[PDB]
Write a protein that binds this ligand. Structure first.
Ligand code: CL7
Ligand code: CL7
Ligand code: CL7
Ligand code: CL7
Ligand code: CL7
Ligand code: CL7
Ligand code: CL7
Ligand SMILES: CCCCCCCCCCCCCCCC(=O)OC[C@H](CO[C@@H]1O[C@H](CS(=O)(=O)O)[C@@H](O)[C@H](O)[C@H]1O)OC(=O)CCCCCCCCCCCCCCC
Ligand SMILES: CC1=C(/C=C/C(C)=C/C=C/C(C)=C/C=C/C=C(C)/C=C/C=C(C)/C=C/C2=C[C@H](C)[C@H](O)CC2(C)C)C(C)(C)C[C@@H](O)C1
Ligand SMILES: CC1=C(/C=C/C(C)=C/C=C/C(C)=C/C=C/C=C(C)/C=C/C=C(C)/C=C/C2=C[C@H](C)[C@H](O)CC2(C)C)C(C)(C)C[C@@H](O)C1
Ligand SMILES: CC1=C(/C=C/C(C)=C/C=C/C(C)=C/C=C/C=C(C)/C=C/C=C(C)/C=C/C2=C[C@H](C)[C@H](O)CC2(C)C)C(C)(C)C[C@@H](O)C1
Lengths: 68, 63, 349, 344, 331
C-alpha cells in the first residue's frame, strides 16, 4: 500500500463515494426523457439517411458534395 | 459548422464538424453530471453498478 | 550602516566594506584612495590612448574617450579638429598620474596613521575632522566646503575658456569665448521654452554664461552651508544615517548620469562632431539604446556611442542602487521577501 | 474586504492585495503605484512607437497607439495627416517618465516610511487624510476633490483645443476651434434625435462645447460633494465597505469603456481616418468584435481596430468584476459553488 | 415546501423550493426575462452583421430581421431593406433591457429579502406582499400587468396610425394607415366571419392593415378596462367562485372554484400554449401581418414549430400542473 503522491491526488475520485447511491428513483425519471429524445434523433437521422424523410433542399446523395 | 437541417445530410462534411462540436458539448455536460450525481438505488441495484462486469456488458454492446 | 535591530552584525568579505562605516579615519582613507583611482584612470588612459593614436584614422573611429575630451578643451587641436601637437595630451596625463600618486600616498597615510576613529587621535586638530552619522551641522559644513571646491572648478573652466580659448565647432577652430551673463536666458533654458532647449545649446557663449552662473551658485551655496545649520524641517524629513546619505547621493548621481548620457548623444556643440562622431538617436526596445546613426561597417562605433551607452547604464544602476540603499536606510529588510509564497504578509517598515 | 463573519482571514499569495485593505497608508501607496505605472506606460510606449516608426508607410497600418493620439492633439502633424517631426513626441514621453518616477517614489515612500495607518501618524496633518470604509461623509469630500481634478483636466483640454488648436479632419490641418455650444443642441444629442446621434458628431466645435459643459458639470459636482454630505437615504440604498465602492467604480468604468470602444469603432471625426484608419463594423458571433471595413491583409490592423477591440474586452471584464465584487459585498460566499455539488 | 408529492426536495426539481419565497421568485422571473431579452438583441446584431443588400431577406435565413422590417424599420418603397442601423439600435436597446432585468434579478435573489412576508411592516415593500391563497393580493398583480400589456398594444396601434405607420402589404410601402373601427366586423373574425365569407382560420384572414390596427385598438381598450376592473375591485365574484369544475378532488363536477399555486401556473401555461397555436395559424395563413416580401411564401416550418410548442405548453404543461394543483386541493 504505497502512499504515492499521485495516489493522494486521485484517491478522492477513486473511492471517496464508493458504494453510495440515493434511495428511490432519483434522477431516473429525467433520464427517461433524454432516452426518448435521442430515440427520436437517431430515428430521424436513419430515415434521412434512408430517404424516407426528405428534408427540403437536402439531397441525401453524392450530389450534396457540391461546394468543395 | 452550420446548424441548419442540411447538416444532417450524411454526404455533406459540414455535418461532421457540427456533430463533433455539439455532441462534444453534450458529452461535457454529460461528464459533469456524472462526475457529481450519484446513481439511484433502483437503477444501482438493477444494473449492479458495483460490479464491473456490467460495464463490460454495456461497453461491448456499444462497440 | 543599517543593522536592523541587532547591532554588531557580522559581514562577510563580499559585503566587507560596511565594516568601516564607523571608523572616520578609515572612511577618509577609503575615499582618498577612490579619488586616486579616478585620477589615475584619467592619466593612464590618456597615455594608453596616445600610444595607439593614428593621425590618418578619424579620431572617433578609433576607440577613445580621452583624446576627444582633451581636444575639445583646447590642448593641441588645429583648425578643423586636427591633432597637430600630441605633446599636451602627454603633459595632461602625466600631471594626472602625479596627482594620483599623491592621493594614493595620502590614502595609505590615513589608513595607517593613527586610530581607526578620528575622535581618539591625540592630534587635537584632526579631532576637528571627526564627524557623526547623526549631526547635521558638521555635515552641512562639509557639504559647504565641497560645494566651494566644485564652484572653484567651474570658475577655473570659465577662466580657461576666456583666456586660453576653447574649441568651437561652429567657428571651426580654437577660440576665446566671452563669458555671457543673462539670467533671463538662463531661466529660459530652465523652462525649455521653444527657442531654448537645454540639450540643444547652440552657442558656447550660452554655455559659458551658464557655467559662470553655476560657479556663482555653488560658491554661494558653499558659504551658506558652512555658515548656516540645517533647518529643523530637514531633520524632520531626512533620516540621519550614513546609508541614507549614500542613498541621497546615489539618486543625485543617477540623475546626473542619465542627463550626461542624453547630452552626449544629442548635443553637437559641447560634443563636437569631428571628435566624438555624428549624433546618436535614442531607441527603446526592451531597454533604451543609442543607435550610432552611422554604418558600423568597417568603422566600429563612434566614441559618442560608447560614452552615451555606458553612462545610460551607469545612471540606471545608480538609480537602482539608490532605491536599494534608501529602502534599507528607511528600515526595510529584504529577508521578508523569502516569505512571499507563504500566507505571511510581505511587509514591514 | 468581505470576510464573511470570520476574522483574521488568511489570504494566499495569489490573492495578496486583500491583506492591506484595512490599512490606509498602504492603500494610498498602492494607488500611487498604479497611476505611476499608467503614466510610465504612456511615456515608454510613446518612445517605443517613435523608435519603430517610418515616416513613409501609412500611420494607421503601422502598429501604433501613442503617435496617432498625440498627432490628433497637434504636435507633429501639419497637413494631410503626416507626421513631420518627432521631437515633441520625445519631450512628452520624457515628461511622462519623470512624472512616473515621482509618483512611484510617492508609492515606495508610503510602503516604507509613511504611516501604515494614517490615523496613527503623529504628524496630525496626515490624520486629516485618514478615512474609514463606512463613513460616507469623508468619502464625499474625497470624491469632490477627485471630481475637481477631473473637471480641471477637461477644462484644460477644452482651452488647449480652443487656443492652440487640435486636428480638424474636415479642415485637414490643425485649427483653433471656437466652441459651438447650445444647451438645446446637447439635449438633442442626449436624446439621440434623428439629426443628432452622439456617436456620430460631425463638427469638433460641438465636441469642445460639450467639453466645456462637462467641465462645468464636474467642477460643480466636486464643489457640491466637498460641501454637501450624502443624504440619509444613501445609507439605505448603498453598502458600506471597500469592496462595494470597488463594485460601483467597476460598473462606472465598464460603462465608460463601452462608450469609448463604440466611439472609436464608429466615429471618424474625433478619430481622423489618416491617423486611425477606416471606420469599423460591429460583428457578433459567439463573442462581439469590431472588424475592418477595408481589407486587413497586407496592413495588419489599423490603430482604430486595436483600440476599440481592446477596450471592448476591458469594459466587459470590468463588468464581470463589478458583478463579482457586488455579490461579494452582498455577503454571498462563492465557497457555495464547490460545496453545493458536494451536497447535491 | 407546500407540496408533498414524492420528490419535493430533489435538486432537479429545486425551483419548487421557491414556491412561497416571494423575493427569490421575483428575482428568478427577472433573470429569466433577462434571458428572453438577451436573445433577440444578440441575434439581431448577429444578423445585421452578415446581412447582404442585393439578396432578399427570405433567402438569407434571418429569423428576427423579418419581424422588424415588417414594421417599416430600415425599409423603403418596394419592400427592400435600405438602412441596417435601426435594427442594430433595436438590438442594443434589448441589451439594455436585459441588463436592467439581470441587475434586478441579482438584487432580489441575494440582496433583497427572501420572503416579502418578512418585510419591515409597510416599508414600500409590504405593499408587494402576495399569498398564493388570498385572491385580493393577486388581483392587483393581474390588473397592473394588464395595464402594461394594454399600453404596449395601444402604443403599437398609435404608432401605426399616426407616426411613421407600418409596411402595408397592399400599398407596397410604409404608410400611416387609416384604422377601421367597425367593432362587429372585427369581432366577427373570432368566429371566422370574414367579410369574404366564413373562413377556417379565425383572426388570420384579415386582408388589410386597417383591420389589424382596429383590432389592436379594440384589444388595447378592452385590456385597459379589464385592468381597471381588477385593480379597483380585487374581490372574488360568482364567476370564479361557484363555477363548475370536474376533478377527482371530488369525483364529478363541483362548484368550488378552487385556487392554488399550481393551478394558477397551469392556467397561465395553457394560455401560453393557446397563444402558440393561434400564432401557428396566423403565420400559416395571415400574410398581411407576415408580408412574404420578408418572411417568404412557404411558411409551413415556422407554423409547425409554433404548433409543437403550443401543444407542449397547452397539453403537457397545462395538464401536468392542473392535475398537481387539483390533487393539492386535498388540503
Ligand atoms: C476578472 C474580473 C475582475 C475585475 C476586472 C476585477 N477583479 Mg478583483 N480583487 C481585488 C481588487 C480589484 C481592483 C482594484 C479591481 C479594479 O480594477 C479589480 N479587482 C477588478 C482585490 C481587493 C482582491 C484580491 C486581489 C489580488 O490579490 O490579486 C492578485 C491576483 C493575481 C491573479 C496576480 C497574478 C498575476 C500575474 C500574472 C502573476 C504574478 C506572479 C509573479 C510574477 C511571480 C513572483 C514575483 C515575485 C517573487 C517578485 C480581488 C479579488 C478578485 C478575485 C477575482 C476572481 C477578481 N478579483 C476578479 C476581478 C479574487 O479572488 C480576489 C478576492 O477578493 O478573493 C479574496
Ligand atoms: C548595483 C546597484 C548598486 C549601486 C549602484 C550601488 N550599490 Mg552598494 N554598497 C555599499 C556602498 C556603495 C557605494 C559607495 C555606492 C556608490 O558609489 C554604491 N554602493 C552603489 C557598501 C556600503 C555596502 C557593501 C559594499 C560591498 O558589498 O562591497 C553595499 C551593498 C550593496 C549591496 C547591493 C546589492 C548594492 N550595494 C547595490 C548597489 C549589498 O548587499 C551591500 C550591503 O549593504 O550589504 C549589507
Ligand atoms: C598630502 C598627502 C595627503 C592627502 C591626499 C591628504 N592628507 Mg590629510 N588630514 C586630514 C584630512 C584630509 C582630508 C579631508 C583629505 C582629503 O581631502 C586629506 N586629508 C588628504 C585631517 C583629518 C588631519 C589634520 C591635518 C589638517 O590640516 O586637517 C590630516 C593630516 C594629514 C597629515 C598629513 C601628512 C596628511 N594629512 C597628508 C594628506 C597629518 O599628519 C594630519 C593628521 O592629523 O594626521 C592624523
Ligand atoms: C512627492 C512624493 C509623494 C507623492 C506623489 C505623494 N506623497 Mg503624500 N501625504 C499625504 C497624502 C497624499 C496623497 C492623497 C497623495 C496622492 O497624490 C500623495 N500623498 C502622494 C498625507 C496622508 C500625508 C500628510 C502630508 C500632507 O498631505 O499635507 C502625506 C505625507 C507625505 C510625505 C511625503 C514625503 C510624501 N507624502 C510624498 C508623496 C509626508 O511626510 C507626509 C506624511 O505621511 O507624514 C506622516
Ligand atoms: C437543475 C435544475 C435547475 C434549473 C435548470 C434551474 N434551477 Mg434555480 N434558482 C434560482 C433561479 C433560476 C433561474 C432564473 C433559472 C432559469 O432561468 C433556474 N433557476 C433554473 C434562484 C432564484 C434560486 C437561488 C439560486 C442560488 O441561491 O444560487 C446560489 C448558489 C449556487 C450553488 C450557484 C449555482 C451555481 C451552479 C452550482 C454552477 C455549477 C456548474 C458547474 C460548475 C460546471 C434557485 C434555486 C435552485 C435550487 C435548485 C436545486 C435549482 N434552482 C435548480 C434549477 C435551489 O435550492 C435554489 C433556491 O431557490 O433554494 C431556495
Ligand atoms: C364553434 C363555433 C364558435 C364559437 C362558439 C366560438 N368560436 Mg372561436 N376563436 C377564438 C376565440 C373564441 C372565443 C373567445 C370564444 C368564446 O367562447 C369563441 N372563440 C367561441 C380565437 C382564439 C381563434 C382565432 C385564431 C378562434 C377561431 C375560431 C374559428 C372558428 C371556426 C370558431 N372560432 C368558431 C367559434 C377559427 O378559425 C379559429 C380557430 O381555429 O381557433 C379555435
Ligand atoms: C373588461 C374585460 C376584461 C379583460 C381585459 C380581462 N378580464 Mg378577467 N379575470 C381573471 C383573469 C384575467 C386575465 C389573466 C386577463 C388577461 O390576460 C383578464 N382577466 C382580462 C381572473 C383572475 C378572474 C376569474 C375568471 C374566472 O375564472 O371566472 C377574472 C374575472 C373577470 C371578470 C370580469 C368582468 C373580467 N375578468 C373582465 C376582463 C370577473 O368577474 C372575474 C373575477 O373577477 O372573478 C373573481
Ligand atoms: C543588463 C546587464 C548589462 C547588459 C549589457 C548588454 C546590453 C545589451 C543590449 O542593450 O542589447 C540591445 C538589444 C536590442 O537590440 C538593439 O535594438 C536596437 C533597436 S530597438 O531599440 O530594439 O528598437 C538597434 O538599434 C540595435 O542595433 C540593436 O542592437 O536588447 C535586447 O535584446 C534586450 C533583451 C532583454 C531580454 C530580457 C532579459 C531579462 C534578464 C536580464
Ligand atoms: C520634494 C521633496 C523631496 C525631493 C527633493 C528633490 C530630489 C528635489 C530635486 C531637485 C532637483 C532635481 C534639482 C535640480 C536642479 C537643477 C539645476 C539647478 C540645474 C542647473 C543647470 C544649469 C544652471 C545649467 C546651466 C547651463 C549649462 C549648459 C551649458 C546649458 O546649455 C546652458 C546653461 C548656461 C543654462 C524629498 C523626496 C527629498 C523630500 C520630500 O518630502 C520633498
Ligand atoms: C436607480 C438605481 C440606481 C441607479 C443606477 C444607475 C444605472 C445609474 C446610472 C447613471 C448613469 C448611467 C448616468 C449616465 C449619464 C450619462 C451622461 C450624463 C452623459 C453625458 C454626456 C455629456 C454631458 C456630453 C457629452 C458630449 C461631449 C463630448 C465631448 C462630445 O462633444 C459629445 C457629447 C456632446 C455627447 C442606484 C445605483 C442609485 C440605486 C440602484 O439600486 C437603482
Ligand atoms: C371559467 C370556465 C372555464 C374556462 C373556460 C374557458 C376555456 C374560457 C375561455 C376564455 C377565453 C379563451 C377568453 C378569450 C377571449 C378572447 C378574446 C376576447 C379575444 C379578443 C380579440 C380581439 C377582439 C381581437 C380582434 C382582432 C385583433 C387582432 C389584433 C387582429 O387584428 C385580428 C382582429 C381584428 C380579429 C372552466 C373550463 C374552468 C369551466 C367553464 O365552465 C367556465
Amino acid at each position: 500500500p504505497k502512499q504515492t503522491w499521485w495516489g493522494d491526488v486521485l484517491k478522492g475520485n477513486n473511492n471517496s463515494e464508493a458504494g453510495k447511491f440515493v434511495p428511490g428513483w432519483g434522477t431516473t425519471p429525467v433520464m427517461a426523457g433524454f432516452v426518448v429524445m435521442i430515440t427520436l434523433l437517431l430515428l430521424i437521422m436513419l430515415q434521412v439517411y434512408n430517404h424516407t424523410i426528405v428534408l427540403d433542399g437536402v439531397d441525401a446523395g453524392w450530389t450534396s458534395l457540391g461546394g468543395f | 459548422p452550420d446548424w441548419r437541417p442540411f447538416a444532417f445530410d450524411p454526404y455533406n462534411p459540414t455535418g461532421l464538424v457540427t456533430h463533433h462540436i455539439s455532441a462534444g458539448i453534450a458529452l461535457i455536460i454529460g461528464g459533469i453530471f456524472h462526475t457529481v450525481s450519484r446513481p439511484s438505488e433502483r437503477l444501482y441495484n438493477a444494473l449492479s453498478m458495483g460490479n464491473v462486469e456490467t460495464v463490460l456488458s454495456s461497453s461491448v454492446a456499444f462497440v | 550602516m543599517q543593522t536592523y535591530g541587532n547591532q554588531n552584525v557580522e559581514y562577510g568579505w563580499w559585503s566587507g566594506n560596511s565594516r568601516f562605516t564607523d571608523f572616520s579615519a578609515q572612511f577618509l582613507a577609503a575615499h582618498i584612495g577612490q579619488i586616486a583611482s579616478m585620477t589615475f584612470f584619467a592619466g593612464s588612459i590618456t597615455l594608453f590612448e596616445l600610444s595607439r593614436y593614428n593621425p590618418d584614422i578619424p579620431l572617433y573611429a578609433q576607440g577613445f574617450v580621452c583624446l576627444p575630451q582633451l581636444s575639445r578643451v583646447g590642448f593641441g587641436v588645429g583648425a578643423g579638429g586636427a591633432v597637430v601637437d600630441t605633446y599636451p595630451f602627454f603633459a595632461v596625463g602625466m600631471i594626472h598620474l602625479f596627482a594620483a600618486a599623491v592621493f594614493g600616498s595620502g590614502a595609505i597615510f590615513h589608513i595607517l596613521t593613527g586610530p581607526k576613529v578620528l575622535a581618539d587621535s591625540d592630534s587635537a586638530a584632526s579631532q576637528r575632522f571627526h564627524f557623526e552619522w547623526d549631526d547635521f551641522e558638521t555635515q552641512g559644513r562639509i557639504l559647504g566646503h565641497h560645494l566651494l571646491f566644485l564652484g572653484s572648478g567651474a570658475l577655473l573652466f570659465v577662466v580657461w575658456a576666456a583666456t586660453h580659448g576653447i574649441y568651437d565647432p561652429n567657428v571651426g577652430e580654437v577660440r576665446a569665448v566671452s563669458p555671457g551673463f543673462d539670467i533671463v536666458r538662463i531661466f529660459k533654458y530652465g523652462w525649455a521654452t521653444p527657442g531654448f532647449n537645454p540639450f540643444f545649446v547652440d552657442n558656447l557663449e550660452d554655455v559659458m554664461g551658464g557655467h559662470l552662473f553655476i560657479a556663482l551658485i555653488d560658491i554661494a551655496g558653499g558659504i551658506y552651508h558652512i555658515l548656516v545649520k540645517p533647518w529643523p524641517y530637514t531633520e524632520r524629513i531626512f533620516t540621519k544615517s550614513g546609508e541614507a546619505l549614500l542613498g541621497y547621493a546615489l539618486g543625485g548621481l543617477g540623475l546626473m548620469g542619465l542627463v550626461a548620457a542624453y547630452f552626449c548623444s544629442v548635443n553637437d556643440v559641447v560634443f563636437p562632431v569631428e571628435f566624438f562622431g555624428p549624433v546618436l538617436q535614442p531607441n527603446l526596445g526592451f531597454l533604451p539604446n543609442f543607435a550610432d546613426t552611422l554604418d558600423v561597417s568597417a568603422s566600429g562605433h563612434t566614441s559618442r556611442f560608447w560614452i552615451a551607452n555606458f553612462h545610460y547604464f551607469w545612471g540606471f544602476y545608480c538609480i537602482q542602487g539608490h532605491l536599494f540603499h534608501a529602502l534599507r536606510a528607511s528600515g526595510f529588510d529584504f529577508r521578508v521577501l523569502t516569505k512571499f509564497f507563504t500566507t505571511e504578509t510581505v511587509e514591514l517598515g | 474586504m468581505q470576510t464573511y463573519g470570520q476574522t483574521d482571514v488568511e489570504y494566499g499569495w495569489w490573492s495578496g492585495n486583500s491583506r492591506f485593505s484595512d490599512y490606509s497608508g498602504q492603500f494610498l501607496a498602492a494607488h500611487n503605484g498604479q497611476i505611476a505605472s499608467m503614466c510610465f506606460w504612456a511615456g515608454s510606449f510613446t518612445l517605443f512607437e517613435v523608435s519603430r516608426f517610418n515616416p513613409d508607410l501609412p500611420v494607421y497600418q503601422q502598429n501604433l497607439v501613442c503617435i496617432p493620439q498625440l498627432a490628433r492633439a497637434g504636435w507633429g502633424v501639419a497637413a494631410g495627416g503626416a507626421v513631420v517631426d518627432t521631437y515633441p513626441y520625445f519631450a512628452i514621453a520624457m515628461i511622462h517618465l519623470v512624472a512616473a518616477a515621482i509618483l512611484g517614489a510617492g508609492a515606495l515612500y508610503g510602503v516604507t516610511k509613511g504611516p501604515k495607518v494614517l490615523a496613527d501618524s503623529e504628524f496630525s496633518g496626515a490624520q486629516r487624510f485618514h478615512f474609514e470604509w463606512d463613513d460616507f461623509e469623508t468619502q464625499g469630500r474625497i470624491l469632490g476633490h477627485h471630481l475637481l481634478f477631473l473637471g480641471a483636466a477637461c477644462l484644460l483640454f477644452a482651452t488647449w483645443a480652443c487656443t492652440h488648436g487640435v486636428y480638424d479632419p474636415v479642415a485637414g490641418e490643425v485649427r483653433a476651434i471656437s466652441p459651438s455650444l447650445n444647451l438645446v443642441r446637447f439635449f438633442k444629442y442626449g436624446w439621440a434625435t434623428p439629426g443628432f446621434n452622439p456617436y456620430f458628431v460631425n463638427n469638433l466645435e460641438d465636441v469642445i462645447g460639450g467639453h466645456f459643459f462637462v467641465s462645468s458639470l464636474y467642477i460643480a459636482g466636486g464643489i457640491w460633494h466637498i460641501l454637501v454630505k450624502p443624504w440619509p437615504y444613501t445609507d439605505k440604498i448603498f453598502v458600506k465597505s471597500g469592496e462595494a465602492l470597488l463594485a460601483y467604480a467597476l460598473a462606472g468604468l465598464a460603462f465608460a469603456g463601452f462608450n469609448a470602444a463604440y466611439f472609436c469603432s464608429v466615429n471618424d471625426v474625433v478619430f481622423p481616418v489618416e491617423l486611425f484608419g477606416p471606420v469599423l463594423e460591429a460583428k457578433l458571433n459567439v463573442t462581439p468584435y469590431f472588424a475592418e471595413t477595408l481589407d486587413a491583409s497586407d496592413g495588419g490592423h489599423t490603430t482604430r481596430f486595436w483600440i476599440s477591440n481592446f477596450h471592448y474586452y476591458w469594459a466587459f471584464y470590468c463588468l464581470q468584476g463589478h458583478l463579482f465584487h457586488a455579490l461579494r459585498s452582498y455577503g454571498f460566499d462563492f465557497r457555495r459553488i464547490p460545496r453545493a455539488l458536494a451536497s447535491l | 415546501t407546500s407540496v408533498l408529492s414524492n420528490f419535493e426536495n430533489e435538486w432537479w426539481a429545486g425551483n419548487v423550493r421557491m414556491t412561497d419565497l416571494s423575493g427569490m421568485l421575483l428575482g428568478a422571473h427577472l433573470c429569466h426575462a433577462a434571458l428572453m431579452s438577451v436573445v433577440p438583441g444578440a441575434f439581431i446584431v448577429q444578423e445585421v452583421a452578415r446581412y447582404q443588400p442585393g439578396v432578399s431577406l427570405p433567402d438569407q435565413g434571418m429569423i428576427f430581421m423579418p419581424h422588424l422590417a415588417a414594421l417599416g424599420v430600415g425599409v423603403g418603397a418596394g419592400g427592400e431593406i435600405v438602412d441596417t442601423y435601426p435594427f442594430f439600435v433595436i438590438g442594443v436597446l434589448h441589451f439594455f433591457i436585459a441588463a436592467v432585468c439581470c441587475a434586478a434579478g441579482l438584487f432580489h435573489t441575494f440582496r433583497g429579502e427572501t420572503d416579502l412576508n418578512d418585510a419591515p411592516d409597510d416599508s414600500y415593500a409590504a405593499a408587494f406582499r402576495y399569498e398564493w391563497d388570498d385572491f385580493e393580493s393577486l388581483s392587483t398583480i393581474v390588473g397592473h400587468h394588464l395595464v402594461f400589456i394594454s399600453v404596449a398594444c395601444l402604443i403599437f396601434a398609435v404608432n401605426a396610425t399616426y407616426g411613421t405607420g407600418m409596411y402595408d402589404i397592399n400599398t407596397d410601402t410604409v404608410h400611416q394607415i387609416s384604422p377601421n373601427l367597425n367593432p362587429i366586423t372585427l369581432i366577427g373574425y373570432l368566429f371566422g366571419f370574414t367579410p369574404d365569407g366564413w373562413s377556417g382560420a379565425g383572426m388570420a384572414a384579415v386582408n388589410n392593415m386597417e383591420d389589424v390596427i382596429g383590432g389592436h385598438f379594440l384589444i388595447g381598450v378592452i385590456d385597459l378596462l379589464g385592468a381597471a376592473f381588477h385593480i379597483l375591485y380585487r374581490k372574488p365574484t360568482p364567476l370564479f367562485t361557484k363555477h363548475p369544475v370536474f376533478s377527482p378532488a371530488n369525483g364529478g363536477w363541483s362548484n368550488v372554484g378552487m385556487l392554488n399555486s399550481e393551478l394558477i401556473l397551469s392556467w397561465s401555461v395553457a394560455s401560453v400554449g393557446f397563444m402558440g397555436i393561434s400564432s401557428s395559424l396566423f403565420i400559416r395563413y395571415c400574410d398581411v401581418a407576415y408580408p412574404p416580401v420578408f418572411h417568404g411564401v412557404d411558411r409551413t416550418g415556422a407554423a409547425t414549430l409554433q404548433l409543437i410548442l403550443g401543444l407542449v405548453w397547452m397539453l403537457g404543461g397545462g395538464l401536468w400542473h392542473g392535475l398537481r394543483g387539483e390533487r393539492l386541493y386535498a388540503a
